[PDB]
Write a protein that binds this ligand. Structure first.
Ligand SMILES: [Cl-]
Ligand SMILES: [Cl-]
Lengths: 316, 316
């Protein structure tokens, strides 16, 4: 269940369409939620949104409730590439739409100055914003991190097209990593085993770039960046967007869970750690605490019911 | 994008609702597809159907195209329970809808005698039918296998509620396993790590029933049954429906992929093995072959195009 919306971009000089999925229970309180921005909305929103909602529903949600925003494309080669090139890594000319490359900076300015402000004005957001980009969308994610964009706390880069304008762009990326000292950011990379690489046909060049880059991040361990990568040998470039999101989003929010099987102070301290990791206050979801109190209340479960009440009162 | 359907069940003496998702390209050829029947359609169809369609789209599909049938419930405790009992495993009374338990036989009859014939008279189906049951729906899968229902060749049992009417029902299942000699059947079990077991509270009783039955199937190795189980320690009883189908359906269709990087006969033999495994004729998807020939055709690929075209003719 989504809303279909439009925004006139004065920056990009065109109409921009997007889709919003509100979390179940949204209308029933003043709870503010995180926002997961999804690139390639037209292609990826349906399967990604349905997964995100499945993971957050039930009595034992695996991730918290989130607002989902799917961003639709107009000129993808312009908006998703951070640098300009007319050629593939082979030196051979890319398709005619390569003439438009190099506008990721401007597209990001649309997200931060036009889209996000509009979203945050319309809905109750909690200051935690996630960006999910697959393929070229991954370069938007890498470029947001590279340019120290303040909006996003966490990035999921699913089989990023790092081969694009390589070695030039990749070199800029590496140099940001070496400089390090990130503003409490998080990065997750899903790496697939695609047998092809654009410009080369049957080759592992695309894959090898991702694996080498992930290895360098791990080896350099820049300060202020939570990083994790997963290699999927049985996935392809396109098929990895679903499982990559699965594992990346579950990883991102794994420590938000409160296992009722434990004390009030343990929960406060755990959310303190999450607040410092995200670089923004993070408090347990009001809905989530109400369920726990219901699972306790309904099941006569210990002082736990009462620990959960005070804990609800703490963050009130 | 589904089709909302209705069938007057003479057997069940009620109106039965269901949803159909046709594979992409359906209207474009005379190709016949397998049918994946999903139980608990009201709650599970949306995320399962989006995953299934996602896994079979693109130039390197992970599973073949299928017809997805989601079956909605009316009286779930009546239709999803193979035996009748008014009590939980603890001996305490179940909720008042326990009085209707034991109708899984008739609900399966509904599928074979009314629903499947109706689907098959309306759509181009290829003889390969798969049943996906989660929780209590997992018990329907078990009973279909237990009572040798001829319609289905493969079953996905996702965190089966084996605790229901235990130890009685479970013993009936075990008796069937020992008797073995299945008629080229397939069973996949997903086993989650839920901290609760109905009627027991915090208890691994439900999980233990699953793990021990899987161990029994593995050790006993009944003739004529391809079996595999996967345990998910980071999943709950409800959350495992998704990743359980993900891995289950991928495992079922794993050997259907043709890597053209190989001979006409290698695929003939490959499909001979699949046919013997499903106990029914299995042939490469017409769309899939056409995808392979056009890639080959595009990439000036040897007489691989010719080999594939050779394959194309053999199965015509
Ligand atoms: Cl930063
Ligand atoms: Cl049999």
């Amino acid at each position: 269940e989504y809303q279909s919306k439009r925004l006139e971009s004065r920056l990009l000089k065109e109409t921009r369409e997007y889709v919003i999925a509100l979390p179940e229970g949204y209308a029933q309180s003043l709870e503010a939620y995180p926002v997961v921005y999804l690139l390639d909305g037209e292609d990826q929103f349906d399967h990604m949104a349905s997964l995100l909602q499945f993971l957050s529903q039930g009595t034992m949600p695996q991730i918290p409730k989130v607002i989902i925003v799917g961003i639709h494309n107009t000129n993808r080669m312009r908006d998703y590439t951070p640098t300009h090139t007319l050629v593939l890594p082979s030196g051979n000319k890319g398709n005619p739409q390569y003439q438009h490359t190099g506008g990721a900076g401007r597209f990001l300015d649309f997200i931060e100055k036009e889209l996000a402000p509009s979203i945050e004005s319309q809905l109750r957001t909690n200051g935690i914003n996630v960006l999910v980009g697959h393929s070229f969308g991954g370069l938007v994610a890498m470029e947001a991190l590279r340019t120290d964009r303040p909006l996003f706390s966490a990035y999921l880069a699913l089989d990023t097209s790092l081969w694009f304008d390589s070695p030039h762009y990749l070199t800029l990326l590496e140099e940001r990593v070496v400089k390090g000292d990130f503003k409490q950011k998080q990065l997750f990379m899903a790496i697939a085993n695609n047998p092809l690489s654009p410009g080369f046909g049957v080759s592992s060049y695309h894959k090898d770039l991702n694996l080498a880059f992930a290895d360098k991040l791990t080896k350099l361990a820049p300060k202020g960046l939570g990083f994790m990568a997963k290699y999927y040998p049985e996935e392809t470039h396109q098929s990895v967007s679903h499982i990559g999101l699965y594992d990346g989003i579950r990883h991102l929010f794994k420590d938000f869970a409160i296992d009722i099987y434990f004390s009030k102070q343990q929960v406060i301290d755990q959310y303190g750690v999450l607040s410092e990791r995200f670089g923004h206050k993070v408090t347990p979801s009001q809905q989530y605490l109400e369920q726990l109190i219901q699972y306790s209340d309904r099941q006569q479960l210990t002082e736990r019911k009462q620990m959960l009440e005070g804990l609800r009162q703490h963050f009130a």
